[PDB]
Each structure stands twice: as C-alpha cells, then as structure tokens.
Amino acid sequence: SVPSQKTYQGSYGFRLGFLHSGTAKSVTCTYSPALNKMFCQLAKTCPVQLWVDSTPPPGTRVRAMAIYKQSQHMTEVVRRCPHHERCSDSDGLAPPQHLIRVEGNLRVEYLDDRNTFRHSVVVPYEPPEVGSDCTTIHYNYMCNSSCMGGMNRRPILTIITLEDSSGNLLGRNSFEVRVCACPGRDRRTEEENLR
Amino acid sequence: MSQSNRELVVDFLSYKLSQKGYSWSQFSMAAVKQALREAGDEFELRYRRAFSDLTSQLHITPGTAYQSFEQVVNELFRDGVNWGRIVAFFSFGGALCVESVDKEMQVLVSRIAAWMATYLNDHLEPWIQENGGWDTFVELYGNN
C-alpha cells in the first residue's frame, strides 16, 4: 500500500516548517531547503513546525508515516536494523519496533497498520499557545538511514498529514530525511554536492 | 613481544562484532580471554539497551571517527590504571563496534580500532606489561 504522497495544502494551508540550523558540523539536526531534506542524528530530537495558514479545530490527528525515496522500494516499510529492536530501548510508551517517536508531547499514539505493516505515529493537534505561532512537534528518529536490514542505506520520505478526529484529510505534506551521526557532514555530501 | 595485549583487545572486539548485524565483519595462561569474555558479555547486554552509559558517553558526537576515539580513550585516563575502569572501557568499545556495523557506519569502528591498535602496541602494551593490567585483573577476578 503506497500512501498518497500528494502535497495537500487544503483549505487550512498545511505547510511544513523546519528550523534552519545551518550547515554547521556541530548540530543535532538541520534542514536543507535546497532539496527539502532534513538531516538528523541518532536518537536525537528533531523539531518540526506546522505552518498552518488556517488554525485547524483542536483535537485533530497528526499522522506521520515514513516511506522510502525510491519508488520501487516504496512498497517496503521503514524499520530498524538487526541490532536495534531487541535493544529494549522502550520507555514504556514508545514501542521498540517503531523507528519514529514523539518527544515533549505526552499525548503520543502509535498507529500500527496490519494490512502492510505500516508503522506510523499519530499525535493529537496541540493548541498553539501565546508566543507559539507554529505548532512545533518534537520527532525523534531512533535509527539511521544507513542502518542495514531496515533502511539499508536508503533515503526516506516522511509524510506528515493532518486528519480530523474521524479521518478526513485536511492537509498533507512530505519531506526527505537522512539520519546519521553528523548532519553537517552528510549535508555537505548532498546539498553542497548538488550546487 | 607476544602481543598478548594487542591480540586480546582485537579478539574481544571481533567477538562482539560477531553479535548481530554484521556485514564486513563477517567476510573481513591467565585465561584473560575467558575473563574478558564473561565480564564483557554480561556488560554488553546492559550497554546494548541504547539508553545506557554509551548514550551519555558518546552522545552522538559530530565526528564519530576521531572524536569518538578520544572520548573513549580519555575515559580510561579519567581514572587511570583501574581494573574496574578497564571493564567499562572494553564495554564501551565492545557495544559501540556492534552498533557501528549494525548501522553500516563503518568509519566509526574502522578508525577507532586503527588508532587504538596503534597506541596499544605503541604505549599501552609496554605499560600493561610492566605496571599490571589483565594479568593483575585475573588475580582478583578468577584467581582470588
């Protein structure tokens, strides 16, 4: 099952916002607007912002499912490497099978598809408080893109979508992700190599 | 120079590298080996929990090839010639090497092992074979 990777801005204007940390070597995570690719570190927190043109009704569902960049590999699911699942890195809320987890927000749920084994995270839409223009969610990648077996050295595309309490598509966006140990280094291997 | 120290270090490393998730690592007396095997394996299982001492030690350094080496090596020197610290030292590298191949990083372990093996025979070996290292470790571990 290949999810609809269509840029659905919708009426609410579901735009994706990321922090521009730069091309510094010493960084936990950085986003490249040159290729719409986000570079993250292992087990590090990645702040993602929801640039909604129109404020959606509080209580909506933010669903995030990651697929592979390669079209022929989109039929596969992004999983962990051989020595990672049996690591027992579960805190009690986050399962050891899920690669993508949520931090900061205690309201975190994991949607495990039993049709194609699609691992996806789903969190309720948090109301933007004073000073918070864009809903910033903390996403944590518990694996690297080079992790053999799972990602197997393949770039992934994380589909961030926003559905209502029932499941109506209000907005859907997507971006490429590359998780390693040095975002600044790997960024210079792609972005600085395409310009 | 039998290189018993240099041999044991790489032997234990290769032993842990044979855990799970290894590609290139598959194709390419005082009973110190047994002593390190038992204690090291029991420690490894605690380090392979991801959220262990490794996370606070390495913390995913933006230079996991040379900076990681100094970090691990300095840890030993943070105590000195301590038989209790040497166990943790081996545990750090042991668990790290597994995740280095498991995550197909390569450069991580490939570089650290190279520098380690160099300094090992360069200063560590003649140091251990004089002051006391694994030889004295067995004395209190399996000969006491």
Swiss-Prot record, chain A:
Impact reported for residue 89 to G: In sporadic cancers; somatic mutation
Mutagenesis or variant effect for residue 123 to L: In sporadic cancers; somatic mutation
Region (Interaction with HIPK1): 5-195
Outcome of mutating residue 137 to T: In sporadic cancers; somatic mutation
Organism: Homo sapiens (Human)
Result of changing residue 130 to I: In sporadic cancers; somatic mutation
Effect of residue 152 to T: In sporadic cancers; somatic mutation
Stretch of the intact protein here: 96 to 290 of 393
Substitution effect: residue 43 to T: In sporadic cancers; somatic mutation
Effect of residue 73 to P: In sporadic cancers; somatic mutation
Phenotype upon changing residue 18 to V: In sporadic cancers; somatic mutation
Protein name in the entry: Cellular tumor antigen p53
Swiss-Prot record, chain B:
Outcome of mutating residue 94 to E: No heterodimerization with BAX
Short motif (BH3): ranges: 32-46
Segments carrying motif BH4: 4-24
Keywords assigned by UniProt, alphabetized: Apoptosis, Cytoplasm, Cytoplasmic vesicle, Cytoskeleton, Endocytosis, Membrane, Mitochondrion, Mitochondrion inner membrane, Mitochondrion outer membrane, Nucleus, Phosphoprotein, Synapse, Transmembrane, Transmembrane helix, Ubl conjugation
Result after altering residue 102 to A: No effect on caspase-1 cleavage
Variant or mutagenesis effect after changing residue 122 to A: No effect on caspase-1 cleavage
GO terms, biological process: apoptotic mitochondrial changes; apoptotic process in bone marrow cell; cellular response to alkaloid; cellular response to amino acid stimulus; cellular response to gamma radiation; defense response to virus; dendritic cell apoptotic process; dendritic cell proliferation
GO CC terms: Bcl-2 family protein complex; centrosome; cytoplasm; cytosol; endoplasmic reticulum; mitochondrial inner membrane; mitochondrial matrix; mitochondrial outer membrane
Motif (BH1): 75-94
Post-translational modification remark: Proteolytically cleaved by caspases during apoptosis. The cleaved protein, lacking the BH4 motif, has pro-apoptotic activity.
UniProt KW Acetylation keyword: no
Subunit record text: Homodimer. Interacts with BCL2L11. Interacts with BAD. Interacts with PGAM5. Interacts with HEBP2. Interacts with p53/TP53 and BBC3; interaction with BBC3 disrupts the interaction with p53/TP53. Interacts with ATP5F1A and ATP5F1B; the interactions mediate the association of isoform Bcl-X(L) with the mitochondrial membrane ATP synthase F(1)F(0) ATP synthase. Interacts with VDAC1. Interacts with BCL2L11 (via BH3). Interacts with RNF183. Interacts with GIMAP3/IAN4 and GIMAP5/IAN5.
Domain notes: The BH4 motif is required for anti-apoptotic activity. The BH1 and BH2 motifs are required for both heterodimerization with other Bcl-2 family members and for repression of cell death. The loop between motifs BH4 and BH3 is required for the interaction with NLRP1.
Family that this chain belongs to: Belongs to the Bcl-2 family.
Protein name: Bcl-2-like protein 1
Organism in which the protein naturally occurs: Homo sapiens (Human)
Classification lineage: Eukaryota, Metazoa, Chordata, Craniata, Vertebrata
Residues shown, of full length: 1 to 198 of 233
